[PDB]
Amino acid sequence: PVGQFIPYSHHVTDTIISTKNAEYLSVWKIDGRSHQSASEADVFQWIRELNNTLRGISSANLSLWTHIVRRRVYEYPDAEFDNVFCRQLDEKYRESFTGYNLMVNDLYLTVVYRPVDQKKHRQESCIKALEDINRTLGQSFKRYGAELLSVYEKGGHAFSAPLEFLARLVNGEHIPMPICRDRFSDYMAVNRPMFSKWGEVGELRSLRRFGMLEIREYDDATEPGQLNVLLESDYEFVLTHSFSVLSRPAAKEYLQRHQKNLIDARDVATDQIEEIDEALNQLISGHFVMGEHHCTLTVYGETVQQVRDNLAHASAAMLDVAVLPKPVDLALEAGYWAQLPANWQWRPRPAPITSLNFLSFSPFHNFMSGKPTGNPWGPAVTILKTVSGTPLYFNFHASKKRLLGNTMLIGQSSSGKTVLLGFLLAQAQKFKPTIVAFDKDRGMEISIRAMGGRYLPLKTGEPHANLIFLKQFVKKLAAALDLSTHQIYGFDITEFLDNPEARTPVMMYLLYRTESMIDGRRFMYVFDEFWKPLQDEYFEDLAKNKQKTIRKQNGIFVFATQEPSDALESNIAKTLIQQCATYIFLANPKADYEDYTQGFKLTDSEFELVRGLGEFSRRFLIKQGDQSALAEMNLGKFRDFDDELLVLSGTPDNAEIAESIIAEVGDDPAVWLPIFLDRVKAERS
């Protein structure tokens, strides 16, 4: 049947998949670096840094395949949660997304090794070859972020992660395939593609038909990335590159052969011969390896007419750059079967290409997209639009016990902090965690009262292991508490935020009940200003000590601060600042350049982007891990954004109206908001 074309046999060492002809393989899922954020210098430096390990480990056995896949992600489930106001917000903001891209970019580089009693010892040598190759590749891809796919247990019979990607490459849809006693190529093809008799187009059944554009460029690329135009598009596709690195002796012979062939001609072109001779000279001195290369683009369209239109648009976009696609009318079968790693024979037209050109054609550049699903709490907490028209799937747990959860939001309170804080909290309600909130203002209280939990403002007139409580109490002497009542809580810090010394004792006592009540159920601590609590003598020490255990539990500290220079990154605050997983920087009209860049390790070009947002532009820079993007949760007409923005923002008049209505209603099924709806806008009008 179709088992002829697929060569993989069985799984070895828990991280390599053996193959027919004894050719060990290893798959890496790479999250590309953000090309947009960085300047022009960083991209060249990244290309050269990759070339470092490429030529460093280069050998005739080595080879690499690169696949980029644009997936219409359905892994977002549109979960259900009981609150009414958050339901309104969720539904409207889902409605806002109509007509916008939901495609994501996934990049894969699969390193493959094909060597050209003592049989077992030679087998050990062969496997340790790929062992060292993977080790050096991992060390070289630390900044990029590389997850070596490996087996993962499931209910007593294992699944191998690498098989899933190689399946997706041929099946076209993510199908979980387990490790069974068979050979993998026997049954990994759940879906067999059917190609046309003449071969112009191909068909795949879920039906999605596909067509292929052959791309081959024989001269050096001007730009570090010439194919990034495709990263935004309305068509799913798979783009492939194979680099079977030739050994140097073969490279010399090929160059001499091509040089002589160009010499023997009726018309002599002095420019091309000089260029080829220069490349020959560079080969010994500029130590870049050459390998056979071929590039194929496999778009996806429901109907052949739509497929042809997508091909035409891709060709036009490519010809905007100086790359001319050659359409494939026949041998589409060979080209498509060339996609599977270790299928050397079916390559349509390999062409020896310098390593620098290969990296220029396929550098790991992709827009930020995060991980829509699989996060430790569940699906992505929320999805945010970005500039350049690509969707961003926001999740807190993104790090470099368990991944870090702490988040930093830096910006002025007026500059969109309120709406973003409220929207993120409302989305995070979908997992139903416990929330403890401290607000620099009375703004948070209306938002909290909208949710299930009732805010507990602090006002004048309303105030054995307990040895710790007594000893902390003595420290102050020197100068409905628990989570049983309801899930969510809010305690005003506006009373003691500006106070010189009243904040410390009440913070010390409150942390007792707050931490001790749940203690391992879940935690999503929120502080509007976290630099005010940290100036304590005792609180910061316990935070730094116990962050490890809180991280072990389902505990995330969503810190925040209006001014980072105000937080001044004191000696005690250093750990809290540095262990932040995801940073969201708002537009800061005033930002001390040196402290801002050096404290956050923010790149110079990223700082240029932050300044570019300037003042009073409702955009933010999200730097998760080691990549960045300019995401704006702008709220316009396509039209409830007006009202759920009106309630979300917190003002003293809104605060007093909220408290009076809550106290006076008695029983109100969040019907104060309809009262709150018009009772406010009348005053502003």
Partner: protein
Amino acid sequence: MKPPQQQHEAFPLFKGATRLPTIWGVPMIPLMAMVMGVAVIALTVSIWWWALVPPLWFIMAQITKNDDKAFRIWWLWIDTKFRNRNKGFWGASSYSPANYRKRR
């Protein structure tokens, strides 16, 4: 309607395009082929080898006097449309824009 006009201010062609090269009523190149065929027959038999020449030659002459240099058209057809393979598979003569996939 047309810049053309009925005028006697003319540059005559002289109709020398009818008097294209010929030796004995035929162009030499097709007649060279006729001589080659006559020699091919002379390989088989000499009695009728020279005899077959006047019939074919007269056919050549009478065809050429009708439509001159049609033999160039015949040669072009034989060279291009005839020699092409896979004519049936494509339903017509086809030429792949892409080069040989192997080319090795």
